[PDB]
Amino acid sequence: QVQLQQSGAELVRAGSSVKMSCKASGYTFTSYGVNWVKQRPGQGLEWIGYINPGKGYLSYNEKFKGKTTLTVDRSSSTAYMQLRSLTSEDAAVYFCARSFYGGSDLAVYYFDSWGQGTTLTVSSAKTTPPSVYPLAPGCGDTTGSSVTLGCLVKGYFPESVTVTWNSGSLSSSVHTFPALLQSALYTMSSSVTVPSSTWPSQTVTCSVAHPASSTTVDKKL
Amino acid sequence: DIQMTQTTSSLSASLGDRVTISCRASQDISNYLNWYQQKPDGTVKLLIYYTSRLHSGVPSRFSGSGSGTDYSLTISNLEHEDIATYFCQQGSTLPRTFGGGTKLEIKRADAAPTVSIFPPSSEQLTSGGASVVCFLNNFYPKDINVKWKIDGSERQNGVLNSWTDQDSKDSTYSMSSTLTLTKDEYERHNSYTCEATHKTSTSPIVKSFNRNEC
């Protein structure tokens, strides 16, 4: 027993304002404080604030007092966190975390139970669809014993692109290099490797499909 | 604020070994140091709390020790389920700070990059650009340097490159390197060259193609 269920991701436009949730079960909601921790990707974890639903105490990290409201629905065992005036730098992952049963001073607590995390991308940029390029062997690239073939999928928004070589078959040999937004625009790549016996001899195809755009691009290679 | 320094950024290790992840606070934090484990795909979990005390279900393989400003986590006999990021934090003062983390990778036998250069395709040229890309693929260790030469001259200009996680299946790293030219910049040069320097080679592997030769 003991689980902290979070809300489910959200994409928000700049200057906006979220409220995340944290459904807590297993124990008596009111006796263990709940903390909120942020994580910018590949930066350390970071403490935002703490609230206890039954002693009547809030403490916030000073740099977050400005944009944050930790509140509570004592009867739905939920905790919410209103993050306001939402900028680029606020895009991260937000864990609530049950502190342990004591209190809060020279510790008397530690984060003994974390939530699954809630993601929040903040962008003032509209739904753009992907551009599925074939990247096929260099001319004069002296005929190997196996061949790497790749799809550049320039520019798109939001995320959730799929790439699929041969409509599902080449599940290994494939590398999805993670997307990385240059200016608003995500961008991705995927490679496939097969012996010369399998290509140009045959049909290698790339299958990009970014659903929130209602796109499905196929490409002969 | 207490600034906690995980001095070690990324740590590589063989299975069955003893690793010591290590944390230094700026104020003496009187043994209010806890260690959290972040697995792949988000999951954070408490291992040690109060320097050296273990949490329920954390294996005896983990252990801590420290005092005042220096503290250390020991994973005696490294198993596969310990590939993760280890974070520590202080609990003497508020706000509770944390360390930047330390990622364990798996050490495996060296692997050389299966490099591949890729020409600008007609459809993007028709769209008005040029992306020469390079796949430095499947290699160990994580250390590599790639180098572009548009003709004999090196170009760090529009080379946006995507690194990768240590593969779940074969413990290697792969890497994309996109050089992003315009149809006329491209149309004013012939040979394009992606170039790789890796542990496993006293010879620079160079990858090329000649623009009009096709």
Curated annotation (Swiss-Prot), chain B:
Disulfide bonds: C134-C194
InterPro entries assigned: Ig-like_dom, Ig-like_dom_sf, Ig-like_fold, Ig/MHC_CS, Ig_C1-set, Immune_Resp_Modulators
UniProt-listed SMART domains: IGc1
The keyword Disulfide bond is annotated on this UniProt entry: yes
Any single GO BP term: B cell differentiation
UniProt KW keywords: Disulfide bond, Immunoglobulin domain
Transmembrane segments: none
One protein family per Pfam: C1-set
Domain Ig-like span(s) in chain numbering: 113-210
Highest taxon of source: Eukaryota
Cellular component aspect of the GO annotation: extracellular region; plasma membrane
Name of this protein: Immunoglobulin kappa constant
Taxonomic lineage of the native organism: Eukaryota, Metazoa, Chordata, Craniata, Vertebrata
Name of the gene: Igkc
